[PDB]
Each structure stands twice: as C-alpha cells, then as structure tokens.
Amino acid sequence: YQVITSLLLGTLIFCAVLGNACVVAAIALERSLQNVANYLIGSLAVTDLMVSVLVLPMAALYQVLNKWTLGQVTCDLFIALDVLCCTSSIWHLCAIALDRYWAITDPIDYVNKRTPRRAAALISLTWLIGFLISIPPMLGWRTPEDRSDPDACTISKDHGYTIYSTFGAFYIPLLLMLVLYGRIFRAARFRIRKKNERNAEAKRKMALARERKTVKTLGIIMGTFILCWLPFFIVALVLPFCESSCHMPTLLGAIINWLGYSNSLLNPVIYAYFNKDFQNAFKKII
C-alpha cells in the first residue's frame, strides 16, 4: 500500500537529486563547461537540486502519510520553499530561452556584449521573481481557513494571491517562453531555408533533416514544460475560484503536483543530458 508509493517517490527523489548533482559537479569540475549558457543550465540544475533536497522529501512524506505531521511552522516553510524553488526553476527555463534567443538572433551581442555577469543577473532575476511569489503569503494574503485545519498543508487560496502567483509563476513565463521559442523557430527556419542535380537533392535532404531536428527539439522543450506544469497551474487557478461543484479527486491532484515536481527531474535530461559537451564531460568523468 503506502510502501509502494513511498518507494516510488523515494526513487524519483533519488533520481532527481542524482541528476542535478551530476550536472552541477560536471559544470564545476570542467573548464570547457564554463560559458554563459552552461552557467544558466548549471544554475537551473542547482535550483532543481534545491527543489529535490528541500521540497521533494517533505512533499513525499506528506503524500505517503496523507496528513501533515511536521507542525504549522514547518508546513508554512515547506509551502514557502515549494513556491520559491519551483517558480525559480520555471523562470530559469525562461532565462535559458531568453539567452538562446539573444545568442541566435543577435550575433553581435553574442560576440561583444555576452559576459557571465549577464548569466548572474538573469539567475538573480529568476530568484527575485521566486521570492516575490513565495513571500507575499508570509505577511498578509493568508486567510484563517489555511490554519483552520492543523492536519493539512495547502497553498493560500485567496483569489487575489491565486491570480498573482499563478500568473507570475507560470503564465507570464509560459507566454514569454512561447514567444521567445517561436522567434527562435522563425530564425532557425530562415537560416535553414537559405552533378548539379545530385548536389541540389543532397541540399534539400539536409535542409529537411535540419527542419525535422529543430521542430523535434522545440517540441521536446515546449512539450515537457507544458505537459508537466500546465496541468498544475490550470487546476491551481480554477479550483480556488470554484469553491463548490468542482470536487478534486485526490489521485488526480497528487499526480498533477508530482508531474510538476518531476519537471525538475526532466530539466537536466533535456537541458544537460542531451547536448554533446555535457555527454563528453560525463564520459571524461566516468
């Protein structure tokens, strides 16, 4: 019963922390992996590591016990670290998208005005939005209904806070990242589009292969982000406004929460375990 779900959450937690730690270590100990893009990917891995060692464990204990057994203060801190680290991870994805968009569409900026200070500013900005989404439920915007049930731990369901958090944590990042990756798609397609018959056929085949590759890569990125977080932030917006007639099954809600938690496990798989430079570094470490 509870043993199976506890084991599944534990192995998920272990895989997430192992992957994030491996990515951070590979970036730290390798001198080739010390550029602005790899710094952003490493900061994303650090944020996901904080998600896996500061949020995942306490969320798993809450899930298997089906009750909060740590106290009101420990529940409040867990919620604060649940919103701060996960919102930071989402904005790290958005910051990586912004860096890629700047690198692809502005080569002059890439050559001249691209420094690790930009990477540090973006990371600080992603943690800043994290703090401004996680702190407001600390002081104010906390209905007494949250504390009315000591044997539960739920995010403040005030309508104003619900709108503010859900937008500034997922929907502003979801529109921003969609726009940036659409522009990147347009740039990549424009670059790809621009005996003699054999060479023309080879060029056509290679261009088609590149178009397939770019559409696949964008599909992987946007699909994972959407299939993990969108299910959670649609419910996290509809449920608070619909107090009644919108009963939420426990199974579906738990699957949805852990789908978003698993977005932190899937981030190193996409942004780190797929490119060639990390694969070579890991082979050199092995």
């Binding site: 692809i104 080569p107 740039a187 990549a188 060479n199 080879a202 290679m206």
Partner: protein, 235 residues
Amino acid sequence: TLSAEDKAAVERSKMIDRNLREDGEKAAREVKLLLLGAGESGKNTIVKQMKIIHEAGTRVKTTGIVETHFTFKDLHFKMFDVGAQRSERKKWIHCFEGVTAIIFCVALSDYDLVLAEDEEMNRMHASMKLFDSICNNKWFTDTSIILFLNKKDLFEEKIKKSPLTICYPEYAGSNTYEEAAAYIQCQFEDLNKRKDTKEIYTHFTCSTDTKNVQFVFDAVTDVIIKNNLKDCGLF
C-alpha cells in the same frame, strides 16, 4: 605562508592573473579569420579593399605572418595572412584551429596561366589542390570557408580571347562570363567533402568599396548564428 615576501608574491600573482583575465576577455571579442591563397591569387587586393576606411580597429618587419585588424559594424575582425610562410603547411596549420572562418582567395584569370615551377601545371589546378587540402583538414572540420574569386574582369576578357577548355578538359558549354564563372564556382564547391558540418560562401570580388567586407561580415554572422543554433540543437 604569512611572510611579507610571500604575501607580496601572492599579491603580484593575483594582479597578473587579473590582467590576464582582462586581456583574455578583450581577445575573445575579436573574430579571427585565416586568409589563404596561391601566390598572386589577389589576396593583397582583398586586404587593401578591407583596409580602405577601417584600420587597426623600433619594431622589426617580420615577413612571416601579417596582421590585419579591421572593424566592421561593431564587430572586431583579425585577418591572418600566411602567404609569405614558405614552408610545410601541416607543421603550423593547427595553430589556426578555432578561427571563425577561412577566407580563401583564388584568381579566376589564372586558368590560362601556369605555375613558374613547371609549365605542365595549371595555376587553377594548384589553387584547387590547395583548396581541397585546406578544406578537408582534420583541424577545419567545422570551420566554414569564405571563397573569393578575384579578377572577374580579366577572366571575362581572357575567356573572350581564349577558351576555358584548356583549364577544364571535361567542361562543355558556350563561353561567356556567367556560365564559366558558375562552372568554376561549382568545381570549387564540389571539393568540399564535409557538406554536413561546413558551408562555403562564394563571392566574386568587385571594385565596390564595401561589398567584399560586407559579404565577409554576413558570412561571419551567419556562421556565428548557425553555431549558436547547433549548440541549442536546432541545426
């Protein structure tokens, strides 16, 4: 450890390391291009063409390697001419591994001409052999080549007076500038075995002041953008 001499030495090392970091940051903002070609292939004309307006952003003349530092549209370029390095190329060609692009200049008008070393060797064939050797080096697997075909007017006059079949026996077509210039360009393109990792940006050198350096800038920006797309996995 904490001695005054050791503290001074560590402070000197830290200051030196800061200066090295600053110099490396400054040097990473410069696009490095390697200019190659055979003798009077018209690379001097190219260098002169790019240094008409923008230049340099008891010393002894070296005659070994030539530095050309020019800035075009907020981009710093550094062109390394090794035409005066009359020695084995493979013993120093790896020193230029990692340049953004290779500017390779061949004169279209030397198809009729032959090398001074021996009459039975066309200058265009020597240039083609050099292009094949430099395009397929293990150092330049991913390095794109900016191909310049200089002396279009002299080539047009020569093909008006002399047929092109002497340089290319297998060639077959009515002799005029456009088709012959396209055939030579395609022959130079076909020497690129690495069609999947590198591209060749062929331009016909023109007397216009800005068009040549503009083409070099466009090729370099298109190389940088494609490298950034390949890094993201989108190319």
